[PDB]
Structure formats: C-alpha cells, structure tokens
Design a protein around this motif. Sequence first.
Motif, PDB file in Angstrom:
ATOM      1  N   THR C 189       0.822  -1.225   0.000  1.00 45.95           N
ATOM      2  CA  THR C 189       0.000   0.000   0.000  1.00 45.95           C
ATOM      3  C   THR C 189       0.850   1.266   0.000  1.00 45.95           C
ATOM      4  OG1 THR C 189      -2.093   0.777   0.869  1.00 45.95           O
ATOM      5  CG2 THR C 189      -0.407   0.658   2.470  1.00 45.95           C
ATOM      6  N   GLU C 190       2.059   1.183   0.547  1.00 47.11           N
ATOM      7  CA  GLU C 190       3.002   2.277   0.737  1.00 47.11           C
ATOM      8  C   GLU C 190       3.538   2.807  -0.599  1.00 47.11           C
ATOM      9  OE1 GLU C 190       5.771   1.130   3.993  1.00 47.11           O
ATOM     10  OE2 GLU C 190       7.342   2.075   2.825  1.00 47.11           O
ATOM     11  N   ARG C 191       3.565   1.965  -1.638  1.00 48.16           N
ATOM     12  CA  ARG C 191       3.819   2.344  -3.040  1.00 48.16           C
ATOM     13  C   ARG C 191       2.567   2.835  -3.766  1.00 48.16           C
ATOM     14  NH1 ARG C 191       9.440   1.795  -5.321  1.00 48.16           N
ATOM     15  NH2 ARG C 191      10.359   0.413  -3.886  1.00 48.16           N
ATOM     16  N   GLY C 192       1.385   2.511  -3.249  1.00 49.20           N
ATOM     17  CA  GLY C 192       0.095   2.679  -3.924  1.00 49.20           C
ATOM     18  C   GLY C 192      -0.434   1.432  -4.639  1.00 49.20           C
ATOM     19  N   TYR C 193       0.198   0.270  -4.481  1.00 48.59           N
ATOM     20  CA  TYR C 193      -0.302  -0.988  -5.029  1.00 48.59           C
ATOM     21  C   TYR C 193      -1.355  -1.602  -4.101  1.00 48.59           C
ATOM     22  CZ  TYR C 193       3.979  -0.162  -7.761  1.00 48.59           C
ATOM     23  OH  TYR C 193       4.940   0.435  -8.513  1.00 48.59           O
ATOM     24  N   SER C 194      -2.564  -1.045  -4.097  1.00 49.78           N
ATOM     25  CA  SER C 194      -3.662  -1.527  -3.252  1.00 49.78           C
ATOM     26  C   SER C 194      -4.174  -2.905  -3.688  1.00 49.78           C
ATOM     27  CB  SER C 194      -4.807  -0.513  -3.262  1.00 49.78           C
ATOM     28  OG  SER C 194      -5.847  -0.965  -2.420  1.00 49.78           O
ATOM     29  N   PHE C 195      -3.999  -3.912  -2.832  1.00 48.50           N
ATOM     30  CA  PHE C 195      -4.551  -5.260  -2.981  1.00 48.50           C
ATOM     31  C   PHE C 195      -5.387  -5.605  -1.746  1.00 48.50           C
ATOM     32  CE2 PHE C 195      -0.503  -5.508  -5.563  1.00 48.50           C
ATOM     33  CZ  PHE C 195      -1.147  -5.555  -6.803  1.00 48.50           C
ATOM     34  N   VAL C 196      -6.664  -5.958  -1.917  1.00 49.11           N
ATOM     35  CA  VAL C 196      -7.631  -6.030  -0.803  1.00 49.11           C
ATOM     36  C   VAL C 196      -8.493  -7.287  -0.860  1.00 49.11           C
ATOM     37  CG1 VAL C 196      -9.572  -4.798   0.313  1.00 49.11           C
ATOM     38  CG2 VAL C 196      -7.731  -3.490  -0.659  1.00 49.11           C
ATOM     39  N   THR C 197      -8.889  -7.685  -2.057  1.00 50.50           N
ATOM     40  CA  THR C 197      -9.826  -8.781  -2.309  1.00 50.50           C
ATOM     41  C   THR C 197      -9.188 -10.120  -1.938  1.00 50.50           C
ATOM     42  OG1 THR C 197     -10.462  -7.460  -4.229  1.00 50.50           O
ATOM     43  CG2 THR C 197     -11.393  -9.621  -4.155  1.00 50.50           C
ATOM     44  N   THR C 198      -9.951 -11.129  -1.514  1.00 54.79           N
ATOM     45  CA  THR C 198      -9.406 -12.477  -1.258  1.00 54.79           C
ATOM     46  C   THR C 198      -8.738 -13.064  -2.493  1.00 54.79           C
ATOM     47  OG1 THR C 198     -11.541 -13.589  -1.584  1.00 54.79           O
ATOM     48  CG2 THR C 198     -10.949 -13.079   0.667  1.00 54.79           C
ATOM     49  N   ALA C 199      -9.223 -12.735  -3.688  1.00 46.45           N
ATOM     50  CA  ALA C 199      -8.569 -13.058  -4.951  1.00 46.45           C
ATOM     51  C   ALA C 199      -7.226 -12.337  -5.150  1.00 46.45           C
ATOM     52  CB  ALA C 199      -9.548 -12.699  -6.070  1.00 46.45           C
ATOM     53  N   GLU C 200      -7.097 -11.083  -4.718  1.00 48.17           N
ATOM     54  CA  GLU C 200      -5.835 -10.340  -4.794  1.00 48.17           C
ATOM     55  C   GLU C 200      -4.823 -10.801  -3.741  1.00 48.17           C
ATOM     56  OE1 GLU C 200      -7.938  -6.610  -4.452  1.00 48.17           O
ATOM     57  OE2 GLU C 200      -7.340  -5.985  -6.470  1.00 48.17           O
ATOM     58  N   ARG C 201      -5.232 -11.455  -2.644  1.00 52.71           N
ATOM     59  CA  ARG C 201      -4.278 -12.142  -1.754  1.00 52.71           C
ATOM     60  C   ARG C 201      -3.441 -13.132  -2.535  1.00 52.71           C
ATOM     61  NH1 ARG C 201      -5.401 -12.094   3.686  1.00 52.71           N
ATOM     62  NH2 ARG C 201      -4.010 -13.790   3.738  1.00 52.71           N
ATOM     63  N   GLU C 202      -4.040 -13.842  -3.484  1.00 55.05           N
ATOM     64  CA  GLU C 202      -3.345 -14.855  -4.264  1.00 55.05           C
ATOM     65  C   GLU C 202      -2.253 -14.249  -5.141  1.00 55.05           C
ATOM     66  OE1 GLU C 202      -3.862 -18.083  -3.661  1.00 55.05           O
ATOM     67  OE2 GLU C 202      -5.121 -17.238  -2.070  1.00 55.05           O
ATOM     68  N   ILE C 203      -2.512 -13.153  -5.854  1.00 49.87           N
ATOM     69  CA  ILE C 203      -1.462 -12.539  -6.677  1.00 49.87           C
ATOM     70  C   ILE C 203      -0.385 -11.884  -5.808  1.00 49.87           C
ATOM     71  CG2 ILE C 203      -3.155 -12.337  -8.510  1.00 49.87           C
ATOM     72  CD1 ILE C 203      -3.204  -9.419  -8.317  1.00 49.87           C
ATOM     73  N   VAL C 204      -0.718 -11.413  -4.609  1.00 48.42           N
ATOM     74  CA  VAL C 204       0.293 -10.957  -3.647  1.00 48.42           C
ATOM     75  C   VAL C 204       1.095 -12.120  -3.066  1.00 48.42           C
ATOM     76  CG1 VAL C 204       0.646  -9.708  -1.496  1.00 48.42           C
ATOM     77  CG2 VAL C 204      -0.915  -8.829  -3.140  1.00 48.42           C
ATOM     78  N   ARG C 205       0.482 -13.291  -2.897  1.00 44.13           N
ATOM     79  CA  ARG C 205       1.168 -14.518  -2.492  1.00 44.13           C
ATOM     80  C   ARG C 205       2.130 -14.968  -3.575  1.00 44.13           C
ATOM     81  NH1 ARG C 205      -1.398 -18.676  -2.605  1.00 44.13           N
ATOM     82  NH2 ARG C 205      -0.768 -19.004  -4.696  1.00 44.13           N
ATOM     83  N   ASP C 206       1.755 -14.863  -4.843  1.00 44.93           N
ATOM     84  CA  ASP C 206       2.660 -15.123  -5.962  1.00 44.93           C
ATOM     85  C   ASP C 206       3.849 -14.150  -5.988  1.00 44.93           C
ATOM     86  OD1 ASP C 206       3.132 -16.737  -8.375  1.00 44.93           O
ATOM     87  OD2 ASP C 206       2.722 -14.895  -9.493  1.00 44.93           O
ATOM     88  N   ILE C 207       3.621 -12.851  -5.747  1.00 39.91           N
ATOM     89  CA  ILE C 207       4.704 -11.866  -5.616  1.00 39.91           C
ATOM     90  C   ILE C 207       5.639 -12.240  -4.473  1.00 39.91           C
ATOM     91  CG2 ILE C 207       5.239  -9.462  -4.967  1.00 39.91           C
ATOM     92  CD1 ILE C 207       2.802  -8.629  -6.642  1.00 39.91           C
TER      93      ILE C 207
END
Lengths: 387, 151, 370, 370
Positions: C189-207
Amino acid sequence: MESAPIVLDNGTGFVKVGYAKDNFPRFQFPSIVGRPILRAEEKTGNVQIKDVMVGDEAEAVRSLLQVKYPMENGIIRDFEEMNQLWDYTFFEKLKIDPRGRKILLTEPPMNPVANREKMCETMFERYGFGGVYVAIQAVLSLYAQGLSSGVVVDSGDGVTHIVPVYESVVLNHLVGRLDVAGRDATRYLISLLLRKGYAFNRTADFETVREMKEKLCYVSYDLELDHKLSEETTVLMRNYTLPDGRVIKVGSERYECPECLFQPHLVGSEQPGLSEFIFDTIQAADVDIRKYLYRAIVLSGGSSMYAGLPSRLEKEIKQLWFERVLHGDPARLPNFKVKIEDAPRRRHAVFIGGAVLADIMAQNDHMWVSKAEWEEYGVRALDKLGP
Amino acid sequence: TFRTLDVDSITEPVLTEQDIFPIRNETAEQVQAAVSQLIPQARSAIQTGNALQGLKTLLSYVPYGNDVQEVRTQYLNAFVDVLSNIRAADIPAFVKECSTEEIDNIVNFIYRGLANPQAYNSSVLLNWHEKVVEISGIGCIVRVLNSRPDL
Amino acid sequence: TALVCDNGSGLVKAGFAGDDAPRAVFPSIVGRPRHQGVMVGMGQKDSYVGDEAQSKRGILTLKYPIEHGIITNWDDMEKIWHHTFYNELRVAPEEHPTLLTEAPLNPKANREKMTQIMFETFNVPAMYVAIQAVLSLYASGRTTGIVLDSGDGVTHNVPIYEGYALPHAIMRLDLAGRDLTDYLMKILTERGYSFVTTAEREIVRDIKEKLCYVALDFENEMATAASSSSLEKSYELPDGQVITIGNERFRCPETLFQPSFIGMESAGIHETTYNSIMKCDIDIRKDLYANNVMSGGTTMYPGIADRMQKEITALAPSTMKIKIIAPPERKYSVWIGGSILASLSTFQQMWITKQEYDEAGPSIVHRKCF
Amino acid sequence: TALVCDNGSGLVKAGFAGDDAPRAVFPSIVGRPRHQGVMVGMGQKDSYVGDEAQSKRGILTLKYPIEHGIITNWDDMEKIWHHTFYNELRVAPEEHPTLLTEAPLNPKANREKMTQIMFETFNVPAMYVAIQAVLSLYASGRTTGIVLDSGDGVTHNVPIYEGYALPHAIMRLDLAGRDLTDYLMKILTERGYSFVTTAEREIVRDIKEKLCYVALDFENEMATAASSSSLEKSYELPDGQVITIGNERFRCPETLFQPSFIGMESAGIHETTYNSIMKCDIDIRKDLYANNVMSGGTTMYPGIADRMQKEITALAPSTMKIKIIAPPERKYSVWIGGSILASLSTFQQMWITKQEYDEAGPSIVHRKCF
Ligand SMILES: Nc1ncnc2c1ncn2[C@@H]1O[C@H](COP(=O)(O)OP(=O)(O)OP(=O)(O)O)[C@@H](O)[C@H]1O
Ligand SMILES: Nc1ncnc2c1ncn2[C@@H]1O[C@H](COP(=O)(O)OP(=O)(O)O)[C@@H](O)[C@H]1O
Ligand SMILES: Nc1ncnc2c1ncn2[C@@H]1O[C@H](COP(=O)(O)OP(=O)(O)O)[C@@H](O)[C@H]1O
Ligand SMILES: [Mg+2]
Ligand SMILES: [Mg+2]
Ligand SMILES: [Mg+2]
C-alpha cells in the motif's frame, strides 16, 4: 408458424419478432405509430389511411401520417401507442392468438421498474400470454456469439449499454448506460443539416434522416485526417435524394454525426463516449479478469454498424491504455492484446440471442413468470427475474 | 487528450519500400566505382563530338539506392549534359533503336532532370520527352510511375 | 498400498506411500461465486476447489478452511478431502489406509474430528495422524535433529533425539506465509499498489513466492535500498500492468526474524530455535546444532539459510560447531517423510482401524498417535 | 497562531489553531467550464474552486483532485490550497505553520509530494502531516478509543490505548460518502430519475444528506416500505420539479454495512470494527468496546449510532459493556482535533521546520510523523 416460445425485441427504433430457434428475425419494422394528417403535401387514392397506422404500414406511407414513437431511451413513454404496436405485432404480423402462449421480452440494464411491471401486466392482461420472461438486452447478445465471457456493448436506437461477463457470471455492479445512441446521432444529424439550411422538423421527416444516416455516415478513424479531407478537399461530398425528390449535399456531416457516440459532449451529454466508457468499465473489473475482457469486447445492436466503428474503437482503446496505464511509454504497447468482435449479424444479436435463450428454457415451465402466478402476487411475481 | 496519440506506428509495423522492391546487391563503394569509371567515357564522348555514343555507353549502367545520392546526382549531371549535346534531328534515330529497357532508363532520368530546374535546362528535357513518348508510346511513362522510388 | 497427505494450512499435497514425490498438490481452498447474477443456460458449481478455484478466482470469494493449522470449516474440509480422493488421486478411499498430519500443540478436538469424518464419511480401512515436524525428520536419513518448519499458517521447532520426542522443549509459533502475505499486502500500500480482495491475496502470495528474499544484514540492506535502485525488481500482474517492488521485498520475510513488524510481541524464528535448544537436556543440546533440518514451504526463501546460520551462531556459544540443513525438496518434506513412514517395514501395525474406532469412538486417537 | 487544514477527500476544512470550528469549509472541487462559447471579456476564468464551483456547476465539469484519500491530480490540488490560504483564510501562508491531515495506509509518495509542494511553493515556516483518526481522538477528550472515521472517500478504524496506537490493528476501507452517492445515482434509476452529469451528482449528494437514514434492521424496513407509502418523502430539484424517494432512503446507507450491494468484497463497518478490535490484545479489548468514537460526515446519518451498536453488540461477547461515542459536531472532529493539537505547549518542538526540510528533502516526513 411455430409451437415454441415467441420472442420479441421491442426496441426503441425497431421491433424485431419471431420464435425460439429462429436464426434471424421473422419480422422487423420501425417501432412507430401514426395518426392521419393533411399537410400541404401530395394526396393519393393509391392508399387508404386508417385511424391508427403502425410499423411498416406507417413508414411506407408516412407523408400522410403524424408519426410518433412509443419509446425513448429504452422506456415506453406512451402505453396507449405501445398497445397499438403490440396489437399489430401479434394480430397482423405474426397472426397469432396469444391466449396461453409463452413470450420472451427484452429491456436495457437500468430501466425504471415501473416499465417492466406495466409491460408484463400488459402481456398478462391485454393479450393473456401464459408465460413471460424478461432478459437484459446485452446478455442476450452473448448467447448469439455462442460465448460466456468478454464485455458485450449494445448500441441501439434508444440506448447504448454495456454488460461485462466472466465465465458465465454477470457483473451487475459494472453494467452501465450511456444515454447516447442511434436516435441522438439522428437528432444531431438534423442539427448539423440545419447549419446548411436543410429543415427536417416535421414528425415524418425523422425516418428520412434515419435512412440518410444509415446510408451515408461513417466513423472517422483519425479525426485530423477526416478534418483534412473535410476542409481541404471535395472528396467527402455526397448527394442524397429524399423521398420528396429533393437532393441535399452532405459532407463533414458524414463523419461529424456518428462521432457523438465517441464524444457525447457534441449532443450536450457530459458522459464519456464508447471508447472511454468501455475502458472505464473494463478497468473497474477485478485484476484477474481484465485480460479476458479486453481479449473479447463484443459489439451489438444497430448503432454499432457505422463503417469504421470496430477499427476506431479498437484503436481508441489501445490509444487509451497507452495514456492511462503505460503513461505514454511505448515499451509495453505490443503486449496489450485487445480484440473487438464485430460479426456480420450484430444488428440483430439481441434477437438472435433471445431466440437461442427462448430454446434453452422453452420446456422449463417454472423458469417463466406464469399468468397464474402474476394474477396472485401481482408485480412481486417478477422478482423471479434475477437481481 | 489521448485522441491524438498514434499507436499504429508502434503496434502494426507497416511495409517498407525494400519489401516491395528487392534491395540492391552491389555495395555503395562498388557502385560508386562502377559509375566513376563511366562518367569519364560520357565526358569524353562530348569532347570528341560523338555525344550519341556517349549516351549509349552512359545508359549501360544505372545507380540506384538511398545510400548513393552523392553519385546519383553525378550520374544525372552527366546524363543531362549528354542530352543537352545531342542534335534534335538525331534523336528519332537514337530512340527507335533503343531497347524498351534503355528507353525506360532515359525517361526515368528525364523526370529526375525535370525535378531540379535550378540546376538543369528543362527545355531540352521536354524536347526529349516529346520525342521518346511519341516514338515509343505512352506505356514508357507508366513504367516510370511504377518504377523504383530510389531511382 | 497406503495413501498420505500433508493436509496443509494453504497448499494440500497428497499421493501414495513409497512414491518419491506427491502426485496431487493444490491450494487448500474452497471458493464460492461472489455475485448473484448468472447466465441461466450455463453451469456453475455450488463451490470450487484447488486449481479450479485458483484459475476461476476473479469471480469468487476464496476461503481457506484451515487457518493457523486448525480445521475452521469442517463442512468445507469435507469438500477438499473429497477433492484429494475422487478428483486429484482418483481413488476409492475404502481400499487405502491413510496417513494424515497435524502440528504439535494443536486443539485436541482437531485430531478427534478428522478421525471421526475419515471413518464415518470416507470409510477408510485404517489411519494414522503424525506430528508434521517428526515426519520432516524423515526424508533426511536422520534420528537426532531439531527440525525447524514453517508452513502457510504454522511455524514450529521440534528437538528429536535418537527417535525420542522432547515435549518440554517443543514449541509452536503462529507466524507463517499467511501473515507474511498479509504484511506484504499491507506494505505494498506504501507504493500505492492496493490489494484487498481475497482473490488479490493470491497474486500478492505469488509476488511473495517469486520476488522476496531474506537479507543477511537488514539494517544495512535497508540503507542499501534507500541509496540504490539495484535491488528493485518488476512483476507483471495477470491484467498486464507492471509493479515495481524494492525494499518491501526483504521487509516481508524479515517478519520471521522480527515478529514485532506485525505487532507480534514474541521471539524471532532464530530465537525460538535457541529457546528450544537451550531448553533441551544439558549434553544433547551440543549436537542439535549439527542436525537442524529446515522444512515446510515458508523455509524456501533465498538468503534464509545464511541468515539462519549467522543468527543462531551469534546466540549460541562460539566454542562449538553450528550448521543449518536446507534440502532443495524442502516444500514437500513433510509428505516425503510420510511416504517413507507409511511404507516402512514396521509401521504396518501402527494404525488406528475400524475394529477399535467402532467401540472407542474418535477418543482413541490421543492414546497412540504421538 | 498555526493553520490547521483538513485535506478533505470531498470537503476541505481550514482554520486557526485554538479556534473551536473551521474558519472556512468548502468542497474539494476544481470545476472547468464545459462550454467554449463565451461573452467576451465578461469576467470568466479557466478554473472555479470550492463554492465558485458549486454555485456555477450547471456549466462546469466538476472533478475532485482527491479520490479514496489519495491526491490523483497535483496541478489542481495546489489550486485548492491556493484557495484555502489566499481566498478563504485571507493570509500569506509563509507567516503561519500548517498542520495537514492524511489517512492511515496511504501511499508514502502522497505524503512526500504533499510535504514537498507545501514548502517548495507556499514556503510555510513549519508543517506536520497527522493521521485523521488520532486527530479525532483529541476532540473526543480521551486517551483510549477505537476511532471510526468515515469521510467522503475513505473509512478507517484506529484502535488506540493510553496514547499507544496499534498500527497492526488498523483497518481501512475505500467505501465512503462518494460510493454511497454513486450507489444512490444508480438505484434512483429504478424510479425513472436519470442523473449523469457531475453537476447532478451534487444534487444526488444533497438528496442523500437531507433524506437518507440508516435502517435499524434492514429487511424489516424493506418489508415496511413495501407495505405502505408511510416511509416515502419528497425533494424539490434546482428546477422546481419534484422527486419522490422511498426504500432508496435506507438502501443507500445500508451499502456501508453491506459492501456487496456495490459488488465490493469487504466486511461492512460493524464487522470491520469488530475484526479491528479482535486484532488487539485481550487486556485492551475490555475497554475499546466502551469507546467506539465516530468521525467524519459519513458517520452522520440518522439512526447510524444505534444500528452501529445493535450490530457490534451481536459480535461482541455479552459480558462486555459496548458504547458508541458520536458527538453532535462529529463532522469536523478531525479539524477540531488538529486545532487542539496545534495549540498544545508540548507539540511545538515536533513540527517539521523549513530548516530541516533543506537538510534531508521530503523523505524526512517518514521519521518526524507517524
Ligand atoms: N448501418 C447502420 N449505420 C448506421 N446506423 C445504423 C445502421 N444500421 C442500423 N443503424 C441504426 O440502429 C438503430 C436501430 O438499431 P436497433 O434495432 O438495434 O435499435 P433498437 O434495438 O430498436 O434500440 P434499443 O436497443 O435502444 O431499444 C437505428 O438508429 C438505425 O438507424
Ligand atoms: N519459493 C518460495 N519462497 C517462499 N515461500 C514459498 C515459496 N514457495 C512456496 N512458499 C510458501 O509455501 C507455503 C506453503 O507451505 P506448506 O508446507 O505447504 O504449508 P503447510 O505446512 O501449512 O502445509 C505458502 O504459504 C507459500 O507462501
Ligand atoms: N448530515 C449528513 N448526513 C449524511 N451524510 C452527510 C451529512 N453531512 C455530510 N455528509 C457526508 O459527508 C461527507 C463529507 O465528510 P467529510 O468528513 O467532511 O469527508 P472528508 O473529510 O474526507 O472530505 C460527504 O461525502 C457527505 O456524503
Ligand atoms: Mg436494442
Ligand atoms: Mg504443511
Ligand atoms: Mg475526511
């Protein structure tokens, strides 16, 4: 004709009608009603004008008629006139007894609920249809493509609207109206032609400028190029002959007219046009599905037919991901696959899709709102028809 | 706003003239040598008065390519000089004996001489244009319209 | 035959005993369609599971039915269990005896209710349910060692000496890849890459799986990132946008060594090794430092073995030798050890089975499954 | 004197420290004319701001340079600060130090470009960039609480106890008075009223402020609204034309408790508050149930404080005593809080002065501020 469900796209500019499994509309005609008038114009014994004249009977004879439109923006404005279209549609185009028949209707995605209620009430209580279903017009156009994902945009005579779909789920929070379509481009064509001094302000002349727009207009692929051909050159000029026999010259008004779908501010709307509306809709979908929407944008409805609209729309989305996602860096543009589906049939995709859907559910008698269910719950019987 | 940003130039790469016409096989210095040996034969043919044998030999090779303007211009200078030194009554005896390949090299370079009047006398090129088209027919201009753009 | 799975707190892996790697491995997820409107001519499931839920995820709420190693949704586990058997391994469970797992210091009733459904719903001939750390001492040719494990929802240290458990020194920490994903998602979030959805947890887990590493000297690496872009990297999201991740890529795994980054006022991953080793018996503690195997998927980070070595060496007395053992098959090692145990030439009598469960109920599992 | 300037995500609030309410308060709007045809020389200009934008709105296109608490448009945001200083407060900013406001979990580059442009253009003597929820706590007159801010663009929880804030327990949600206005513009289509211009959004905002309320129990109010016109009300447009509105009066605010009405995957503000207190340690949880402070204009609806209580008391265990603290001035509580803070004797050493910005650039704000 057929024993299967009847299907009716009562569009704002054209009624289209037929039955389940029809590959093309059984009939289509202008959604117009007319009353007799005399007008310092030609009269003839070649035709007899009845007190109410509608559909093809009116449009073929409209020099003699006060033409009126029962619909605007996808909503019925006057039900006494829509009753005179529906009488004609069933009793003297299809030639049907509606008693106990099942019918599929259509309406756009954000109508007043009072419109669907009084449209179903009329089907149960003038005609006495045994079952009714009402589908959102753009989700029908996705059954025509044989398809289950990719954002479908429908532009008709009354309304342009968009319905994102992914893996057969319909994203109800992203469905949208642009209140600019084939009629606002026609009122605008009258207003462009008025700058040249040509006046079309009789009620019967509106179908003449619809036929003129439909014949001669095109969407400019590159505005500074068409403004070059327009201001530097005669090559755009085209002669159109009215049914009066008068000839009128039309030039920049060929591209400058359908441009109001891409620039609604030309017709006084503040809304964003097709390219920016489809982009701000796809780019509002969740991160995992945006690829599958840009890879399959589906065009639909008669106002999507302008020559150059598929190419202008594809360019103007590549051009807009480039501004708003790449910030003008060319390095990634080749990775952005956007595809527009622009099939030959697409003017009728809502009907052709309705005629597919009305086969899928013909035998499932609980899927329709039945007359017997309407007459006990009233308007609350329509809560069967989704969110 | 975005409407003016071109994308076709960076997502749909267009054809190039070297896709439509085959690229020249001879290298720049290899044609610059081949021309520089011929121009002295043409200059000599004027100085010995046999200017018509000057044209016949000068026209035996033609330089072309976007890499060679500094020698295409020298070839054109020699060609316009040779055309300005042939007697107008000898022209019909030269043109009727040229091949259709040589004619399409003459009329191709007279349309290069007619493009630069501040360095070439147009009056003698227009005279050659009348005589070459009257004798050999209108199609010899059509083969110039259609010809390579780096000629 | 026998059939074994690490019923994992984020990534199930399953297969047959004596196979050298698990034949099924999929997200420990039940997903459900998020929107009320569906095309009325077309199929949707009640709910999706595994790689099907993972590939469908843009329209789903994703629920992990296991959290911190505890079955939280038995009614959803009954779907992912069924998925291991009938969809991924394609077996009939009534033919195959089964090895399950759980962490040490788990809720006692978890051991019971999984036993209850395995006999009353999956009809199995027999089962056992081993400590995940103990299985992860196997698949290393070993009988003394302090196994260090980090899964998706669990971390633990178990000192085993010559085949004996040591339950005064055993300890578990509720930090793992889930909390590291929450923290990475938060600091992005500190960069502005807002990920919030349970589906977006997965792409953040991949990162987190792809871009992260454990820095060797965090307070100086942080100054290195402040002074040079040479450690920033680019990741492409599934829509085609590109994301620049810098000092956040090593701040994330640092949470294992500094749990106070997620407000957890508790001992670090290296310190829990020392607080278990220095709680072991007075002589055996001197060679746990020679046999400390790393296991579970969160131990896969690049740089972690070098960090783990230097930090426990700074805490321990420098008179004695220290290493860390980090197998390249780390992320399967619980299952590899289960495959060995369930095929071992003395283990075929070890199980619970219906003839005892039909009279003791599930209450028997605490009597021989440790 | 010091300035306090709340960077409202829809409604700017500006004034002098120690004064008990904002000296000027106006929409965070820059409006541009949507017509090129003009009466020449007749006093027009290429940007109208705040009340010049509202009073002229029929001919303007209005855009807020803040969205979801993030400044999206800097060349226009400095026009709003120029208006706060020179046209509303009627001061030279270079004479007075400025306390600015920010949401929690915002992009650090927002706070950097804010502190940069505030010194690099307006040349203030000193400045500070406080978090909105800890500001609201000062106006409530207490040291423990769980402030629930709910503005135009963001809503957030900050659990805070004897002045120790809990940064791991913070929750933030991008659902607020803008999205409730979007949903009202959407659902009013069902009556046959079409609102589409950015001017008509302000009419739908004024309807939402005057006529909407939170249902105490939603599916009971839905049944009541279907049973009678007893619940319907009327509004007169800026046209003399009349609007009638019914269950839309409470379906709009209900979005704040049911984000799935706008397709968004989130907990509502009851569940978000509960999951924020349940992220704090159990000794603190006993007190923050008694101190749910509320802040910002989306916490202002009729019936919200009682329904917020009836929902949070269903999640909290019955032994707890559970209270909502909702002042009658709650709309401005972050500004009153900043007015208190900027007036404290103990605060005056911890401004960022112009002198120490020159020694480090804008990245100093991350050590001087929370
Ligand atoms: N080739 C064309 N070029 C331009 N306009 C066209 C063309 N073909 C059809 N149209 C326009 O499309 C409109 C009719 O399309 P359509 O039948 O899809 O509208 P509709 O369904 O009746 O309207 P709506 O869906 O809004 O209720 C008319 O404005 C017509 O002039
Ligand atoms: N390359 C990697 N680097 C870091 N973490 C990884 C890597 N590959 C997988 N993971 C982590 O592995 C975890 C799964 O570990 P696993 O052993 O399956 O957990 P569990 O014991 O609960 O069953 C995931 O949370 C994921 O974040
Ligand atoms: N009395 C009220 N009742 C309901 N909503 C209100 C009321 N007064 C103002 N609003 C809401 O207040 C919001 C502005 O709140 P505010 O706290 O000032 O937001 P911000 O500080 O972030 O700019 C507007 O979006 C509006 O929807
Ligand atoms: Mg239509
Ligand atoms: Mg595991
Ligand atoms: Mg605010």
